[PDB]
Structure formats: C-alpha cells, structure tokens
Design an enzyme around this catalytic site. Structure first.
Site, PDB file in Angstrom:
ATOM      1  N   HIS A 102      45.872  30.603  36.751  1.00  0.00           N
ATOM      2  CA  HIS A 102      44.778  31.791  36.685  1.00  0.00           C
ATOM      3  C   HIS A 102      43.482  31.695  35.937  1.00  0.00           C
ATOM      4  CE1 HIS A 102      48.148  34.716  38.454  1.00  0.00           C
ATOM      5  NE2 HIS A 102      47.294  34.345  39.405  1.00  0.00           N
ATOM      6  N   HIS A 327      37.850  43.625  37.686  1.00  0.00           N
ATOM      7  CA  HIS A 327      38.646  42.372  37.789  1.00  0.00           C
ATOM      8  C   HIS A 327      38.716  41.838  36.327  1.00  0.00           C
ATOM      9  CE1 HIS A 327      39.496  38.322  38.961  1.00  0.00           C
ATOM     10  NE2 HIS A 327      40.416  38.927  40.031  1.00  0.00           N
TER      11      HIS A 327
END
Ligand code: JTA
EC number: 3.1.4.-
Length: 438
Positions: A102, A327
């Site tokens: 990620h 986000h």
C-alpha cells in the site's frame, strides 16, 4: 510554511481551494528538478496515464514501478508496461497471507539533487481527480561531494529510516536507490518516517514498524501535558479491517494505547473515527462511484457493529472539500477544544491490523501483513510545544498546522450509516442521477 503538506487538486471546487494544491503534473514538472530517474511505489497503476503525467522531455527517463501484484494481476501490469522500454518493475515480496503493498512514494533523482514524495494516491486518473488526498514533499536534497565523508542525516533520523525501509524489500532494483540515497544530504528533513513492512518482529525489532514505531517516537520525542487524558485521539481513514468482536480485542487495547502515548512516563481518552457515511458518498462530486474506493464490505461490518458508534462524518469546509471523498488517511492528537494538536500523521495505513500490526505470542511479537508508509509531524522537531490548528486550510504565523478537515468532527446522526461498498443503495440518487447496484 515549514510543513510542506499539500492536498491534491480537486476538479470542480473554486480556484481559491486549489491555490496551494498539487496535481501530479506539478510534482513532475521541470520546475521541481531536471529528472534523471524515478521510482514509483504504489498499489494500483495505469501505466499509460502515468507516463503522460511526466513532462514530454522526461517521458523516456528510467522509471521503476514498485508493486505487490502476483499471478494474473502481475501479468496484467507487465503487459501494461511492455510498450515502454524505459519502465522496469519490482515485485515487493508478500510472504504473509492477505498482505498488500500500500506504500505510496516517489523517489525523484534530478541533476540537481534528490526529492522524496510520500503521498496517498494511486497512480490512476480517478485518484487525482475529485478525491481528498495528501502529499508530503521533501526538500531538494543536494548530493554529497565525491570524496566528502558526512552522514547527511537529519535530527529525525529520516535518512537511516528510509534506507531501513527500502532494505526490507531485499530487492536489487531498490539497492540501487539505497546507494543513491546514501550519496545525498537529507539533513534538512524535519519529519519522522513511520513504516510498516510484512513480518513477525520481536525483541530489538519490535519498535521498528507499525503502531509500535509510533509508540516509540511518541515516547521519545513528545512530552506529556497535564490533563493529557482529556486530549482526544482522531483517526481518519478510507477502509476498515476486521477489528474483532469488541473494542478490547485490538482497537482500544493495543492500537489506542500506542496512539495515546506521550513522553517517557507510565483510559477515558475520547476516540473520534472519521469515515464517510452513505450520505457523504451519495452527495459527493463523484457520487456513488466514490464508494468504489472505500472498500468496507458488509461481511466485515456486520461482525463489528460496535465500531460504528465511534464514527463521525467527513466534513472539510476548511479546505472546500466536504464533497471530495477522502482517500487520505490521517491520525492526530488534538487538545480538548481542538485548537492545538500534539502531533499529526499522514499515511497510507487504514484502520486495520494488517497495516498497523497485531501482537502475537503472549505480547512478544508484532505481526504485520502489508507495506505502508507515512510521515509524522512532531512539534519538538520544529522547536515547538504543540501546533496551533490553521483555521482555514488555504489561508494565511506560519507555525500553524494545516489540518485538512473540520474540527470537532461531527458524530453520525441516528439515520446515518457507514458507507459499505458491496450492498445496494436505491432509495435516493447521487449527484449524477444514479443508484448503486453492486
Ligand atoms: O489505495 C489503496 O491502497 C487501496 C487498496 N485497496 C483498495 C481496494 N481493495 O481491493 O482492497 C479497493 C478499492 C480501493 C483500494 C485502494 O484505494
């Protein structure tokens, strides 16, 4: 400002709310340096789009894509890159089940020096279009003269910590970037690196990653104030993992305990969690499709309804971004009246054990599944006791920290529900006239 924390540009808000924002084209422009080589660490890539974000004169310079994909997903990425001879790929090893890569980072090697960008956006058009995303931009780091011996290290140990993070990949293409970092002077860095890498860490390595890394930094470089138990903890994220059958399993036992650390000495501290409601998503600039990037499944959610009492709506009037779904992920420690903060963290880590780590083996071992990266802003690293909160994110002493959403956070109303991406919403249409039918 000394913080160099930016939001991405949002299409559709008034120009005042994009004035100090950055698009990826700005980050890669020749104004920031004459590009020689770059490394793009990310989760999701659209290679055709990515290459078009580089200026035309830089589009044939070497690019390394660092990803976590396996099997068919890996094949798809290789096929995307195949047309571009200057693009190389590095597959990050993920030896623990259900791990992901990620980390979102750019390493930019210039004629003039080196820059590091740690951010929260995938390398696809939609992540830079109408979302709230965060970016930390390093200074231009100069090269250390050939024949000179100096550390190039910052008081926050950023150079050593970044090399340590890259060494965890055990990857030949990143050993090249480690050698590049060694040759540059990073001493001006005022942020602390907080990373996660996959593995099981005991002993001297337990404090290296995840929420134990955060705990260690807060013990060593923050100070406890009187009435510290009154200073809330705020967490703000775009996804939630399975946290257990109750708050004592992980959320308030080990996670919150790490986040409420301050100073070296040995709980009713309030915990505010910010996560978009269904209404937040429906009325957003993107409408329901924004929920495609908020992947909270009904299977997980139904097992932990206790968690939703902690949830607060997304609201961002301060930066004009209430309708730009988050986000970015952020964690911070505000004062009881939310006018000051003891620290601020921006990161790729969502609210999950995978990213922050979970204790195993009678509390002696920290197990992390995924790669994550973020930067921690501590007042002591700027010569301060605390940060004042900036009242308007894009407004004008530069020692006030630009928090991108509204404080205090607003609790869900009785009719509100957390956005859950794999059930239908057919009662009211979104800003484009559509329903959501998974
Ligand atoms: O940025 C990230 O790290 C990230 C990771 N995973 C995502 C998933 N997924 O499949 O888990 C669905 C939708 C958005 C995702 C996302 O934005």
């Amino acid at each position: 400002n000394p913080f160099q924390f930016y939001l991405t540009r949002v299409s559709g808000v008034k120009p005042k709310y994009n004035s100090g924002a950055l698009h990826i084209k700005d980050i890669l422009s020749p104004l920031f340096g004459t590009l020689v080589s770059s490394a793009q660490f990310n989760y999701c890539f659209d290679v055709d789009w990515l290459v078009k974000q580089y200026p035309p004169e830089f589009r044939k310079k070497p690019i390394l894509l660092v990803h976590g994909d396996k099997r068919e997903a890996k094949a798809h990425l290789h096929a995307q890159a195949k047309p571009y001879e200057n693009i190389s790929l590095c597959q990050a090893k993920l030896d623990i089940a259900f791990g992901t890569h990620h980390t979102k980072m750019m390493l930019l090697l210039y004629e003039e020096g080196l820059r590091v960008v740690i951010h929260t956006s995938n390398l696809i058009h939609a992540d830079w279009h109408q979302k709230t995303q965060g970016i930390w931009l390093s200074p231009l780091y100069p090269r250390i003269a050939d024949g000179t011996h100096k550390s190039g290290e910052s008081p926050t140990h950023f150079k050593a910590d970044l090399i340590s993070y890259l060494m965890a990949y055990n990857a030949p293409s990143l050993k090249e970037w480690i050698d590049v970092i060694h040759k540059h002077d990073l001493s001006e860095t005022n942020v602390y690196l907080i990373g996660s890498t996959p593995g099981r860490f005991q002993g001297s390595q337990k404090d290296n990653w995840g929420h134990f890394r955060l705990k260690k930094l807060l013990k060593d470089h923050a100070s406890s104030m009187p009435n510290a138990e009154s200073w809330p903890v705020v967490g703000q994220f775009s996804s939630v993992g399975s946290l257990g059958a109750d708050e004592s399993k992980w959320l308030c036992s080990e996670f919150k305990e790490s986040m409420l650390t301050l100073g070296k000495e040995s709980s009713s501290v309030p915990l505010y969690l910010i996560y978009p409601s269904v209404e937040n998503v429906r009325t957003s600039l993107e409408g329901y499709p924004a929920g495609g990037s908020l992947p909270y499944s009904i299977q997980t959610a139904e097992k932990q309804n206790w968690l939703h009492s902690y949830f607060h709506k997304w609201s961002a009037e301060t930066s004009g971004r209430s309708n730009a779904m988050p986000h970015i992920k952020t964690y911070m420690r505000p004062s009881p009246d939310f006018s000051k903060i003891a620290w601020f963290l921006v990161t790729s880590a969502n609210l999950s054990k995978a990213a922050w780590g979970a204790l195993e083996k009678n509390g002696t071992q920290l197990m992390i599944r995924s790669y994550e990266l973020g930067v921690l802003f501590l007042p002591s690293a700027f010569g301060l006791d605390s940060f004042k909160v900036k009242q308007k994110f894009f407004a004008g002493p530069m020692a006030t920290f630009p928090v991108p959403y509204d404080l205090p956070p607003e609790l869900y109303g009785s009719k509100d529900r957390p956005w859950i991406w794999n059930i239908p919403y057919v009662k009211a249409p979104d800003t484009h006239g559509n329903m959501w039918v998974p």
